[PDB]
Design a protein around this ligand. Structure first.
Ligand SMILES: Nc1nc(=O)c2c([nH]1)NCC(CNc1ccc(C(=O)N[C@@H](CCC(=O)O)C(=O)O)cc1)=N2
Ligand SMILES: Nc1nc(=O)c2c([nH]1)NCC(CNc1ccc(C(=O)N[C@@H](CCC(=O)O)C(=O)O)cc1)=N2
Ligand SMILES: [Cl-]
Ligand SMILES: [Mn+2]
Length: 159
């Protein structure tokens, strides 16, 4: 099964780390926890922002063009990407925007962090029809000394 994971601001805006104005260790801990030991698929731009392979995870980069780093697995198509994951129970799609869009229709679960922040951005997470998804977990957190803004973690499953 394919699952998408992402941190959304108001308006479904998403953006790279440095582009994002919040500092949320709790959300990074959640991302870590839900992706560990699973293969992760990301776009080139995401790969470049991350800087190094995420440890304990098979890193697959979807890109039309040739790879430039032997530490990760380069694939050229969405099908190729799934094939490279092998026989695993859950594949995590970590963005960015275009990658999310390509995998949404194949996805069965979404792990979302809704951050209470207004920020400008080009990029938005794909529109998904709420009636087509069921919320199975939600949990609100206020901001604190460590965490810049308030957030709500949510897990949705395709009905
Ligand atoms: N919920 C959620 N929060 C995010 O911050 C996030 C996401 N989803 N989906 C994709 C994405 C892409 N960007 C990034 C950027 C840096 C790291 C990083 O160092 N992660 C460490 C933190 C521990 C890790 O090992 O996972 C991960 C994803 N970031
Ligand atoms: N687009 C979108 N934006 C959001 O802000 C959003 C969303 N989707 N998805 C999930 C979500 C979760 N937000 C929230 C907000 C408040 C509580 C909350 O008050 N929880 C209390 C229960 C209080 C009551 O029923 O009075 C709790 O402690 O569980 C939980 C989740 N927020
Ligand atoms: Cl990307
Ligand atoms: Mn070499």
């Amino acid at each position: 099964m394919i699952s998408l994971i992402a941190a959304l601001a108001v308006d479904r805006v998403i953006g790279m780390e440095n582009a994002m104005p919040w500092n949320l260790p709790a959300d990074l801990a959640w991302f870590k926890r839900n992706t560990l030991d699973k293969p992760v698929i990301m776009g080139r731009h995401t790969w470049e922002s991350i800087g190094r392979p995420l440890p304990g995870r098979k890193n697959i980069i979807l890109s039309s063009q040739p790879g430039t780093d032997d530490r990760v697995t380069w694939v050229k198509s969405v099908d190729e990407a799934i094939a490279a994951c092998g026989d695993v129970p859950e594949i995590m799609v970590i963005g960015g925007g275009r990658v999310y869009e390509q995998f949404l229709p194949k996805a069965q679960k979404l792990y979302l962090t809704h951050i209470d922040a207004e920020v400008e951005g080009d990029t938005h997470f794909p529109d998904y029809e709420p009636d087509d998804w069921e919320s199975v977990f939600s949990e609100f957190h206020d901001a604190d000394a460590q965490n810049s803004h308030s957030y709500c973690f949510e897990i949705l499953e395709r009905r």
